[PDB]
Design an enzyme around this catalytic site. Structure first.
Site, PDB file in Angstrom:
ATOM      1  N   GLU A  36       0.875  -1.979  -0.140  1.00  0.00           N
ATOM      2  CA  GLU A  36      -0.131   0.067   0.498  1.00  0.00           C
ATOM      3  C   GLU A  36       0.898   1.180   0.028  1.00  0.00           C
ATOM      4  O   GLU A  36       0.686   2.583  -0.616  1.00  0.00           O
ATOM      5  CB  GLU A  36      -1.237   0.395   1.316  1.00  0.00           C
ATOM      6  CG  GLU A  36      -2.054  -0.667   1.170  1.00  0.00           C
ATOM      7  CD  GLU A  36      -2.914  -1.071  -0.218  1.00  0.00           C
ATOM      8  OE1 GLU A  36      -3.293   0.024  -0.330  1.00  0.00           O
ATOM      9  OE2 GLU A  36      -4.103  -1.763  -0.844  1.00  0.00           O
ATOM     10  N   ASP A  53      -6.633   8.538  -0.714  1.00  0.00           N
ATOM     11  CA  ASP A  53      -5.730   7.910   0.308  1.00  0.00           C
ATOM     12  C   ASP A  53      -4.521   8.064   0.847  1.00  0.00           C
ATOM     13  O   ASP A  53      -3.433   8.609   0.481  1.00  0.00           O
ATOM     14  CB  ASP A  53      -4.954   5.847  -0.875  1.00  0.00           C
ATOM     15  CG  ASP A  53      -6.734   4.926  -1.757  1.00  0.00           C
ATOM     16  OD1 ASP A  53      -7.748   5.919  -0.795  1.00  0.00           O
ATOM     17  OD2 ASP A  53      -6.527   5.158  -2.357  1.00  0.00           O
ATOM     18  N   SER A  76     -11.902  10.991  -4.686  1.00  0.00           N
ATOM     19  CA  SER A  76     -11.093  11.183  -2.863  1.00  0.00           C
ATOM     20  C   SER A  76      -9.427  11.287  -2.839  1.00  0.00           C
ATOM     21  O   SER A  76      -9.116  10.766  -3.703  1.00  0.00           O
ATOM     22  CB  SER A  76     -11.712   9.970  -1.695  1.00  0.00           C
ATOM     23  OG  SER A  76     -11.416   8.405  -2.925  1.00  0.00           O
ATOM     24  N   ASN A 128      -7.916   9.325  -5.777  1.00  0.00           N
ATOM     25  CA  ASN A 128      -8.617   8.222  -7.142  1.00  0.00           C
ATOM     26  C   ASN A 128      -9.480   9.475  -7.736  1.00  0.00           C
ATOM     27  O   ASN A 128      -9.300  10.043  -7.640  1.00  0.00           O
ATOM     28  CB  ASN A 128      -9.138   7.499  -5.859  1.00  0.00           C
ATOM     29  CG  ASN A 128      -8.772   6.846  -4.776  1.00  0.00           C
ATOM     30  OD1 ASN A 128      -9.211   7.773  -3.809  1.00  0.00           O
ATOM     31  ND2 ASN A 128      -7.596   6.238  -5.041  1.00  0.00           N
ATOM     32  N   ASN A 149      -8.799   5.676   3.141  1.00  0.00           N
ATOM     33  CA  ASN A 149      -9.593   6.727   1.893  1.00  0.00           C
ATOM     34  C   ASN A 149     -10.404   7.435   2.437  1.00  0.00           C
ATOM     35  O   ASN A 149     -11.516   7.265   3.386  1.00  0.00           O
ATOM     36  CB  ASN A 149     -10.824   5.807   1.352  1.00  0.00           C
ATOM     37  CG  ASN A 149     -10.955   6.341  -0.265  1.00  0.00           C
ATOM     38  OD1 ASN A 149     -11.614   7.363  -0.617  1.00  0.00           O
ATOM     39  ND2 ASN A 149     -11.633   5.387  -0.858  1.00  0.00           N
ATOM     40  N   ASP A 186     -12.483   9.258  -8.614  1.00  0.00           N
ATOM     41  CA  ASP A 186     -13.688  10.119  -7.568  1.00  0.00           C
ATOM     42  C   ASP A 186     -13.360  11.832  -7.396  1.00  0.00           C
ATOM     43  O   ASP A 186     -14.186  11.562  -6.517  1.00  0.00           O
ATOM     44  CB  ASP A 186     -14.334   8.830  -7.286  1.00  0.00           C
ATOM     45  CG  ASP A 186     -13.941   8.508  -6.071  1.00  0.00           C
ATOM     46  OD1 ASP A 186     -12.873   9.296  -5.066  1.00  0.00           O
ATOM     47  OD2 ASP A 186     -14.796   7.512  -5.178  1.00  0.00           O
ATOM     48  N   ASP A 220     -16.204  -4.456   8.949  1.00  0.00           N
ATOM     49  CA  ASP A 220     -17.037  -3.814   8.804  1.00  0.00           C
ATOM     50  C   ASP A 220     -17.389  -5.156   8.037  1.00  0.00           C
ATOM     51  O   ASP A 220     -18.741  -4.388   7.503  1.00  0.00           O
ATOM     52  CB  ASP A 220     -17.123  -2.763   7.761  1.00  0.00           C
ATOM     53  CG  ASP A 220     -16.350  -2.821   6.493  1.00  0.00           C
ATOM     54  OD1 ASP A 220     -16.028  -4.072   6.852  1.00  0.00           O
ATOM     55  OD2 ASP A 220     -16.134  -1.886   5.780  1.00  0.00           O
TER      56      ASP A 220
END
Ligand SMILES: [Cl-]
Ligand code: NA
Length: 129
Positions: free
Chosen positions: A35, A52, A50, A46, A59, A48, A101
């Site tokens: 990562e 990281d 957003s 990203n 994110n 969209d 989650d």
């Protein structure tokens, strides 16, 4: 800060990640390697819009506030900047909410593509823990 492999394994173990939701320490070290290359200051944008953040590339779409991701959630209740610190505590506490989650470590694309079903114990080989 750029962590050494064994240095990071030891910090993650101290923070309760060893076998957290059944994921051995090797899994978390492998994820951080692909990562961020073990760099707490890693950022990536990203498509969209957003971003990281940090050692585990958390994110801004769901998990942290960076003030520039319109209509996003802040499910870890922190500024995204707290995830870039040399102290991994905030990254670790947020990672525990993510892996809990329902999708486990499949939330991390590099884990799914580069760690899952590999010999992950090799990532902690030789370390004093
Ligand atoms: Cl799971
Ligand atoms: Na957000």
């Amino acid at each position: 800060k750029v962590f050494g492999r064994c240095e990071l394994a030891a910090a993650m173990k101290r923070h309760g990640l060893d076998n957290y939701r059944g994921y051995s320490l090797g899994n978390w070290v492998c994820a951080a390697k692909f990562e961020s290359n073990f760099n707490t200051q890693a950022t990536n944008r990203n498509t969209d819009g957003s971003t990281d953040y940090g050692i585990l590339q958390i994110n801004s779409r769901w998990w942290c506030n960076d003030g520039r991701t319109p209509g996003s959630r802040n499910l870890c209740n922190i500024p995204c900047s707290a995830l870039l610190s040399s102290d991994i505590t905030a990254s670790v506490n947020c990672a525990k909410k993510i892996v809990s989650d329902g999708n486990g470590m499949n939330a991390w694309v590099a884990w799914r593509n580069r760690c899952k079903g590999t010999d992950v114990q090799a990532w902690i080989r030789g370390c004093r823990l």
